[PDB]
Write an enzyme that holds these catalytic residues in place. Structure first.
Site, short mmCIF file in Angstrom:
data_model
loop_
_atom_site.label_atom_id
_atom_site.label_comp_id
_atom_site.label_asym_id
_atom_site.label_seq_id
_atom_site.Cartn_x
_atom_site.Cartn_y
_atom_site.Cartn_z
N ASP B 479 0.83 -1.21 0.00
CA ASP B 479 0.00 0.00 0.00
C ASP B 479 0.87 1.27 0.00
O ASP B 479 2.11 1.18 0.08
CB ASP B 479 -0.89 -0.06 1.24
CG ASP B 479 -2.16 0.79 1.14
OD1 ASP B 479 -2.39 1.51 0.14
OD2 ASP B 479 -2.92 0.69 2.09
N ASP B 549 -11.01 1.65 -2.45
CA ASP B 549 -11.49 1.56 -1.07
C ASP B 549 -13.02 1.59 -1.00
O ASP B 549 -13.60 1.28 0.03
CB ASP B 549 -10.91 2.67 -0.20
CG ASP B 549 -9.45 2.41 0.21
OD1 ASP B 549 -9.05 1.22 0.23
OD2 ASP B 549 -8.75 3.39 0.54
O1 LIG Z 1 -4.69 1.70 6.51
C1 LIG Z 1 -5.06 0.58 5.87
C2 LIG Z 1 -5.76 0.80 4.56
O2 LIG Z 1 -5.14 1.74 3.71
C3 LIG Z 1 -5.88 1.94 2.55
O3 LIG Z 1 -6.94 2.92 2.57
C4 LIG Z 1 -6.18 0.73 1.77
O4 LIG Z 1 -6.52 1.00 0.46
C5 LIG Z 1 -7.01 -0.14 2.58
O5 LIG Z 1 -7.44 -1.29 1.90
C6 LIG Z 1 -6.39 -0.37 3.91
O6 LIG Z 1 -5.33 -1.27 3.72
#
Ligand SMILES: OC[C@H]1O[C@H](O)[C@H](O)[C@@H](O)[C@H]1O
Ligand SMILES: OC[C@H]1O[C@H](O)[C@H](O)[C@@H](O)[C@H]1O
Lengths: 729, 729, 183, 183
Positions: B479, B549
């Site tokens: 990420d 997300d």
């Molecule tokens: O903080 C964790 C978070 O960070 C992001 O928003 C990702 O896209 C999520 O899927 C999650 O992993």
């Protein structure tokens, strides 16, 4: 008065009876744009921007508040380096190599009138009570730069004028890589965008587009405002037309490279910047120096595009143009260019002068080919002395002849340019703009002077004064026939070569200003291969400008209609020329060429001596009729009525007291089985009674605007009809 | 073979059975674009550009020919300084301060295969006979710069791949201020332009626009390819749709700042550039050094957008992605993020693991919160060691538990980032990306590492290897949760700070490449707050990527449809999450969440332990059915059938032999009085007979594609139906 | 087809007529300029080109023609007799509609060995965009000779690449092309 | 003469409206709920609306997309009705207009309507048109001249209107012969 600052809510309000403009100081000293539109008396905090945590829109330095972001807030300005990912209004390069700038509100002032812009054209006031100006200063406390954002409101116009001045109060230089004149960000608006694209002999057609996410850019890199994209745009409601709906117009008062950016962003907001193009723009701002941008004229209309245009026309004509001729009826001239091109001598021109006198014309303009050894467009630019083979007794002898026949005399010059085959180049080869070591590219087989250098401007100035001091030349056509391609200024260090484009324009303005102020008694007409430098900055110096080298009546409908979106009709000139047309081969009726050429300031550009008696008497008749109506056609309030895409183009002018109107309607393509069409008027007093001067019939203003009348139905393409109405007592 | 050079007419022809691409050497060694489109066997000079004297379009140095201009000719490339006033493909700054570059044809070569791009992701070949590459070299004889333009054609794909390599053979450095990967100019095309704009939790909606005169720009400045605008566009006929009409697609294989420019010019031509954004891009190219751009994938379809997309899907999956998992069925995983956020410990996660096993899930992925002292998103990035309070016996103990229950184990990392409250910052504060002397701006209360520095990458690499060498982690979610805002690299001289953005991406690619090549046995899933770095460059490293997300079934229709315009469905992941949805509050049927999440690679992201027995048995059923169809849904040829703006969204996948198909149809808004609707299939063999596995009825492929069938009519919003067909013998 | 015998309005009328009706079913006559129904002035060559889409005839006082115009009729007639089997009975493809500012069409014989193409520009422009015409209905694997220039092009080239239209001044200008497959 | 009802089709409708000296321009419209009627009451098929319509996909053009064409083989009053109904279906009728139509059908008598030609194209409007052209030319037209090249004629109407006598026409005949005309 017109501008208030509320120090409790930190809101600035510029307002008059027509418009309000509201901005505020938000978190972190961020200058926020709240509103521009119809006037309101008061503001009560209801446009505070919602506070939302928007993913990837980051926050102020040292802040824990995720719900405020310089990447989401609507703003009056922006920069690289402040956590904003829109196209930024300004970009600075620091000695450390970074592009960091973080501006925060510092102070404000409110002044009567508006300040003169050093070295640049600008709108102005005749009395201080005509306007007020707010100047908001923003500072970067690390680089010690200050940005002054100027906002002027006139008491009686729906206009806000904006510009920017940057000041370096630090110990080292910075480089300005971009400085927009203004930024405005709209929330929850679904606008279309109108611009005026074109080309040589095809300027300023009206274009209208939807706005999608991304950035739409309307610009020039040519060192001029350009034929290809005028420095103008308007944002309009989907349903806005000539007579209803909201419109925001933006015109940049600059005659060089421009950039208009319209960005629809990820939250549906529309972010606009306008200013000097950032292409090869890198201005070295030393300690204790300042940089002033050109200004932008911003008009709000709540009732269509004609009202928007009329506000630009009035502001430009009344408070930008400085010529003593701006309020004087413009002469009906003949120009020999299409008549002879370079193939003439004094005896030939004297025959045209003789015929012009008989036809009632008021001025003879001698176009290209009179100077140096200018037999064609391959030599002599820079050699501004008479070509003796063509004028064996000198230029004064010919001017005297013109005056003796009762006409004024005009003369073409192209002062910014140089030919390899010129005495000027032989004497001063370093005056030609090029990158040392590289052969420059030609265009019309000529090159551009280094007008950023005072010594180059002084040379051209002295040549011109030697002709003009005689006062035998009543009018100057100042032309400019190529774009800039080899961008350099030979007296500047390497690190200042990003100043060449703007210094060229500053130099142009300095030379032109010196000449128009030395010669207030001469009517200057701007030109750049037609309308290649047709902008509000130019208006400050020349009150009329050759609209296009395309003199076809029919394509001129498109060009003149678009031009009029911003520019008053007295600022554009229009000449009756030969049919078939020299640029596109179209065959048009003589009456249609006349009618279309009476929208702009009328002139003639064809070999009068080759006309039959029947055609010559038609010129007499056109001229006689134009002299009766030209106060109204040149200076009356303009209403566009029909656009040529409908197959008709129509417009009209109404005097300031709504007592007199002149209307023209042109049909483009003929049809064997035509639909009946009506023309309705605009801008009249519904309670006055107007006589049609051709038919003697009388109609209420209400009838003329609501009922209208039927257009004549005739065979043949490209037909025109004019109407003249006068209120009766 | 695939590429020919005709040295008499000076024409290069790349062709296969599907496409032809033609370019030529024009006057002054100018490289001209002739054609890209359906294949032709031969070329006979009929696309020689008309020679017209175009006002203000100037000419070659020392030329007297006014009818040839680098400002009008359609070209394969362009620069500032060559008498072209389009937005240029490249801009160079020389030691003299000028922006002059004048490139002219020098030479060519034709090679089998295609060259590896140093330091960058790229398409490749398994055997040399799969493709050929033409490299045309252009030179500036004054600055001694050479530009190599690479063109690759695959034998059996409707694709051309382009990139550029710049070489400095002079004695002094130059700075590259812009270097596009490609330019293409079209004559007499009236295209619309399709792009994929968006925002966080709202990526890649399909947008389609007309193209007006001016420049439309689709770009990112965020240091990533971005949520707001994907690095993709397609130019299409007005009448192109999913199943017919021409389309030209362009995808940039780059994961940093991009810029796509579409300029409709003064002569109606459409000029396109694509490459690294020029925003704060200034690359110092020293003598004897080279600069390689990323490449662009160019697809031509003569039969609609599905065919275009399918060519991208095949090229990306077969000849860009390198993962050993790219051809392996992807596991049905559960991820704890929406289930617990940071509020968990080992005992809590073990209960989720237990329930996942009972439901038939194949992998448990431990998301954010397991490392440092990561109780929330305000600390600990950079401290990649287990949080003992949450895992009292260490991370290996938990991974062992997961494996003992028969599941694979995955782990989230965010390797590019640093928190002020971290041991990493305390030990190495200079590793945090900022402009010295200026407090940087936070975003999600975190900052970016200086990944352009090897020592910073080495630190993170060593931390990760210490965990990963155990082989207890089968999968990594990598990420990246903020954009770059304070652009600097502390080990570079001031004059190289315009390299910071691109060196960051190069550093990212170097670190990521080192890890994916050390760990070919680990499945890497890319992520950047969802789909904020969802591009062809990323595919080279990670064969699947978290699409958004936003896990709402209904908004995922829009996001997944747009994503699929370029990217194969196995590259996007999709999880069933709780209703009401956590991001927008929408209430959806569980079956609809499942159906939409089977378009991407299915997973679950909700607290399984809170499900009733009735809901848990529904997961069992979804999983069981997905395991029967996922070879076809993950890897079959994708056809989009209906777009959600119609009120329905529908798509299907067909196996490579057209023996099996899986179709999904989702209705969005319910209506009390609904219109009957039909769904027609695509991509089947008209002469095979297909059994509907639910009903046992059998239909010809021709019937399914031409007649289709009626959709069920049911009450309630947001309803889905799936169909599975198999050809019978 | 119509009492309107203006070449330019006949583009609209003949294009629409052809949506249903074969071109041999519509007749088309070269008439005087200025046109008797709408007053339009057109080149004689444009009246001929548009009137060869339908079955050609003449409807004007031939005895009032100058020798120069009469010889132009001879030339039109001579050329029409060489192409009329293909223009009257070949498969019709409409290529461009007059609202685009150009109207273009072509006919191809039943064996795809011969084609006759016409392209008419309506309004002249001082600064025109370059335009191309692409053909249809040919065999991509045959080689076609342009009988005016003697140059030879694959059917695939003519349909996919097309060629540039001439750029000339003046309203209402037409050009015709005749292609024949070579052995 | 016929009715056809479509389910889940979002067509546009193409027709050929006009007037005297302005026949058969191509018109293309969206279809909204209600009934759109294309007809004649003039006792003829008419200049104002040809007895034809086509239903097409929004994205259909001359070279791609589906088209359904309908041409009524009748030279009197016609009526084409295109009704988009309350359930989104498109209901079409074509036949003799019902305006002042009341036919007395006695016991043991019959009434035959004209027929309608219905063409389906899966690849644009040229293909649709070409199917009509071929059917009309090959299997409707009965003239022995239908497969014969048509003469290049001169017609005296615009040349003289009513202002002629035999001597005047003989001079036109003489000139026509010299120009190579055939009739
Ligand atoms: O903080 C964790 C978070 O960070 C992001 O928003 C990702 O896209 C999520 O899927 C999650 O992993
Ligand atoms: O060369 C002379 C010439 O230059 C330009 O094209 C102008 O716009 C013309 O009006 C004419 O003055």
């Amino acid at each position: 008065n017109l501008i208030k600052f509320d120090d409790q809510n930190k809101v600035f309000h510029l307002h008059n009876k027509q418009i309000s403009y509201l901005l505020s100081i938000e978190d972190g000293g961020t200058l926020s744009h709240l509103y521009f539109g119809g006037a309101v008396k008061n503001y009560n905090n209801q446009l505070k921007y919602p506070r939302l945590d928007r993913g990837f829109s980051g926050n102020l330095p040292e802040s824990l508040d995720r719900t405020f972001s310089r990447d989401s807030l609507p703003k009056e300005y922006s920069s690289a380096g402040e956590m904003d990912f829109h196209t930024p209004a300004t970009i600075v390069r620091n000695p450390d190599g970074s592009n960091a700038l973080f501006l925060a509100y510092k102070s404000y002032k409110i002044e009567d009138g508006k300040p003169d812009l050093k070295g640049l054209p600008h709108s102005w006031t005749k009395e201080d009570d005509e306007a007020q100006t707010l100047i908001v200063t923003l500072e970067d406390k690390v680089s010690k730069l200050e940005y002054d954002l100027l906002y002027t409101i006139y008491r009686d116009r729906p206009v806000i004028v904006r510009s920017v001045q940057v000041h370096n109060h630090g110990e080292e230089a910075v480089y300005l890589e971009k400085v927009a004149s203004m930024q405005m960000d709209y929330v929850d608006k679904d606008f279309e965008v109108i611009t005026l694209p074109g080309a040589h002999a095809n300027e300023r057609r009206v274009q209208r587009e939807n706005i999608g996410q991304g950035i739409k850019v309307f610009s020039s890199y040519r060192g001029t405002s350009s034929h290809q994209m005028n420095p103008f745009m308007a944002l309009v409601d989907h349903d806005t037309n000539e007579f209803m709906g909201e419109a925001y117009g933006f015109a940049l008062a600059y005659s060089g490279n421009h950039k208009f950016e319209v960005e629809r962003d990820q939250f549906g907001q529309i972010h606009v910047n306008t200013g000097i193009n950032d292409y090869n723009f890198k201005w070295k701002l030393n300690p204790n120096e300042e940089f002033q941008t050109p200004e932008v004229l911003m008009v709000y209309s709540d009732q269509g595009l004609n009202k928007m245009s009329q506000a630009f026309h009035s502001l430009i004509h009344e408070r930008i143009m400085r010529s003593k001729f701006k309020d004087q009826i413009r002469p009906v001239l003949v120009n020999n260019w299409e008549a002879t091109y370079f193939d003439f001598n004094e005896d030939k021109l004297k025959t045209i002068v003789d015929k012009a006198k008989k036809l009632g014309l008021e001025m003879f303009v001698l176009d290209d080919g009179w100077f140096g050894h200018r037999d064609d467009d391959n030599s002599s630019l820079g050699d501004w002395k008479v070509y003796k083979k063509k004028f064996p007794n000198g230029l004064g002898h010919f001017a005297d002849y013109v005056h003796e026949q009762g006409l004024k005399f005009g003369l073409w010059f192209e002062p910014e340019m140089i030919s390899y085959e010129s005495n000027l180049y032989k004497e001063h080869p370093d005056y030609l703009m090029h990158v040392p070591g590289r052969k420059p590219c030609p265009s019309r087989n000529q090159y551009v002077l280094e007008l950023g250098r005072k010594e180059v401007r002084d040379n051209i100035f002295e040549q011109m004064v030697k002709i003009l001091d005689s006062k035998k030349i009543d009018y100057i056509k100042w032309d400019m026939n190529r774009s800039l391609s080899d961008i350099y200024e030979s007296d500047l260090p390497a690190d200042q070569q990003g100043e060449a484009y703007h210094r060229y324009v500053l130099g142009y303005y300095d030379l032109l200003n010196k000449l128009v102020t030395r010669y207030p008694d001469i009517l200057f007409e701007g030109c750049s291969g037609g309308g290649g430098r047709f902008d509000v900055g130019q208006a400050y110096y020349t009150p009329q400008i050759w609209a296009s080298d395309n003199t076809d009546a029919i394509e001129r409908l498109k060009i003149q209609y678009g031009t009029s979106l911003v520019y008053p009709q007295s600022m554009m000139t229009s000449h009756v020329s030969v049919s078939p047309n020299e640029q596109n081969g179209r065959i048009t009726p003589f009456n249609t060429r006349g009618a279309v050429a009476m929208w702009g300031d009328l002139g003639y550009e064809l070999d009068l001596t080759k006309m039959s008696d029947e055609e010559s008497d038609q010129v007499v008749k056109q001229v006689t009729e134009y002299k009766k109506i030209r106060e109204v056609t040149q200076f009356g309030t303009l209403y566009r009525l029909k656009a040529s895409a409908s197959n008709q183009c129509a417009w009209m002018m109404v005097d300031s007291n709504k007592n007199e109107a002149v209307v023209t309607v042109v049909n483009v393509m003929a049809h064997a089985q035509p639909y009946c069409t009506k023309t309705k008027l605009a801008g009249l007093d519904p309670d006055k009674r107007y006589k049609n001067l051709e038919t003697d019939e009388v109609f209420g203003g209400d009838e003329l605007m609501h009922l209208g009348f039927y257009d004549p139905i005739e065979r043949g393409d490209f037909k025109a009809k004019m109407y003249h109405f006068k209120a009766i007592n």
